[PDB]
Amino acid sequence: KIRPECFELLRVLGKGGYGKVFQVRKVTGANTGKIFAMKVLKKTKAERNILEEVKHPFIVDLIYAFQTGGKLYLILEYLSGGELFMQLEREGIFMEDTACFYLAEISMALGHLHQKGIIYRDLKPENIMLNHQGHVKLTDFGLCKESIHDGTVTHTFCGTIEYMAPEILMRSGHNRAVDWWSLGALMYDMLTGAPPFTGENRKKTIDKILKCKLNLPPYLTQEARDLLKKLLKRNAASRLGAGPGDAGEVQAHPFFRHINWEELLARKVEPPFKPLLQ
Numbered sequence: 001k002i003r004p005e006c007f008e009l010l011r012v013l014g015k016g017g018y019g020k021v022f023q024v025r026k027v028t029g030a031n032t033g034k035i036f037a038m039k040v041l042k043k044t045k046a047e048r049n050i051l052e053e054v055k056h057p058f059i060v061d062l063i064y065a066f067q068t069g070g071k072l073y074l075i076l077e078y079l080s081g082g083e084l085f086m087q088l089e090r091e092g093i094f095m096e097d098t099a100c101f102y103l104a105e106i107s108m109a110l111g112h113l114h115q116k117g118i119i120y121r122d123l124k125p126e127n128i129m130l131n132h133q134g135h136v137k138l139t140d141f142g143l144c145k146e147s148i149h150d151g152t153v154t155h156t157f158c159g160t161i162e163y164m165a166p167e168i169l170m171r172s173g174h175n176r177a178v179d180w181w182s183l184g185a186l187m188y189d190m191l192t193g194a195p196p197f198t199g200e201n202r203k204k205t206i207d208k209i210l211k212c213k214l215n216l217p218p219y220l221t222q223e224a225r226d227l228l229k230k231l232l233k234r235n236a237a238s239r240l241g242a243g244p245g246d247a248g249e250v251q252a253h254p255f256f257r258h259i260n261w262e263e264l265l266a267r268k269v270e271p272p273f274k275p276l277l278q
């Protein structure tokens, strides 16, 4: 039987309005000494449900889950590699091979989610973690990681909306196509140093995202520009990935022509950055 006393708290990894995350050490049972991430939620139901259903090398693992008092406890694999964001922040702009690597792993995680009817919605780089090897882990399935909350009910607009598809901002209904939009916004951020549609304030950013007039920098390879054009489109249904092939359609793009998907998935491809060496 698992309970909070089975874990000593080592440090605060993050704290939001609705939850808090610790690095923890288990001190009982056969995983004695094992390090985990512990997320504590003040009761969140769809989050646990998703993690119990998903199982993929590029999606974070859920080890234990329990509730005691008013709190829900998720015990996740500890990811020492930090946020994808941190790497983008240090590098300024990714080389295309670099960007390619991460987008390729991500696209596989998204394939898995969609096959199970799950939508990630928001690929802002602080929502993508790296494991100790430097491989991608999607981690963000909870309510909202923010301190101050937009509106007073729903949590779409709370953090940056710079990677969110037009139809999400409009609340006009949406599907998995939004995730391929967000992949394009992430890809654009990686390659250019900023997301595709930014304003001076909130209102303007939304307006630029809705107008969706893409500026493709001339510096990028032909294959990169063509993929970005195919991802960042207002018409959700016409996005690469929006069709029957889902991730398949995206993975077959020339931009990924050097990817052995078998090797990538087995994590036998060397990540461009190794957190243990940094």
Ligand SMILES: C1=C(c2c[nH]c3ccccc23)CCN(c2ncnc3[nH]ncc23)C1
Pocket (backbone or CB within 6 Å): 013, 014, 015, 016, 017, 018, 019, 020, 021, 037, 060, 076, 077, 078, 079, 080, 129, 139, 142, 144, 145, 146
């Ligand atoms: C950052 C997180 C976070 C930051 N601010 C928050 C506010 C509310 C809820 C969560 C957060 C969450 C995930 N995270 C992780 N770090 C390391 N191993 C991890 N395994 N699984 C997740 C995880 C670090």
Ligand SMILES: [Zn+2]
Pocket (backbone or CB within 6 Å): 144, 145, 146, 148, 149, 150, 154, 155, 158, 159
């Ligand atoms: Zn919020």
